[PDB]
Ligand binder design. Structure first.
Ligand SMILES: Cc1cn([C@H]2C[C@H](OP(=O)(O)O)[C@@H](COP(=O)(O)O)O2)c(=O)[nH]c1=O
Ligand SMILES: [Ca+2]
Length: 129
């Protein structure tokens, strides 16, 4: 896989963000994760976490997997990086997302993310508390 440039247009919530990619505005949905909706417990905290990570970044990147690049709602499906740190992994490691939506052929980072999840569960963080 390879990282490609993007810029932040606006934070949306824990697992979606509006980015400019190839010069066009798109909503991205983070691969392999599920954050609570803003209305649910830890939803606001997941939102804040990804808003801060994206807004403080000097360099946002997206990385597509081998499979589908957009979902049925037209959202881009990617791993999102903020100054080299994967947002998808960081959410899972902090117990603010669960590993989820693992579809065959878009699952390159699955085991990385499951190892973070095991760590967050051991530490009893957030969703695992
Ligand atoms: C993360 C992900 C979600 N989706 C679709 C499955 C879910 O369909 P349904 O809307 O029919 O439940 C929805 C979950 O996204 P959200 O968690 O953002 O709601 O998005 C994909 O198709 N591919 C993906 O990789
Ligand atoms: Ca969600």
């Amino acid at each position: 896989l390879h990282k490609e440039p993007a810029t932040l247009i606006k934070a949306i919530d824990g697992d979606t963000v509006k980015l400019m990619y190839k010069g066009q505005p798109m909503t991205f949905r983070l691969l392999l994760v599920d954050t609570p909706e803003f209305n649910e417990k830890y939803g606001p905290e997941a939102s804040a976490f990804t808003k801060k990570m994206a807004e403080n970044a000097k360099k946002i990147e997206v990385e597509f997997d081998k499979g589908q690049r957009t979902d049925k709602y037209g959202r881009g499906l990617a791993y999102n990086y903020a100054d080299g740190k994967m947002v998808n992994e960081a959410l899972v490691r902090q117990g603010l997302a669960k590993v989820a939506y693992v579809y065959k052929g878009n699952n390159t980072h699955e085991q990385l993310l499951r190892k973070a999840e095991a760590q967050a569960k051991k530490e009893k963080l957030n969703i695992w508390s």
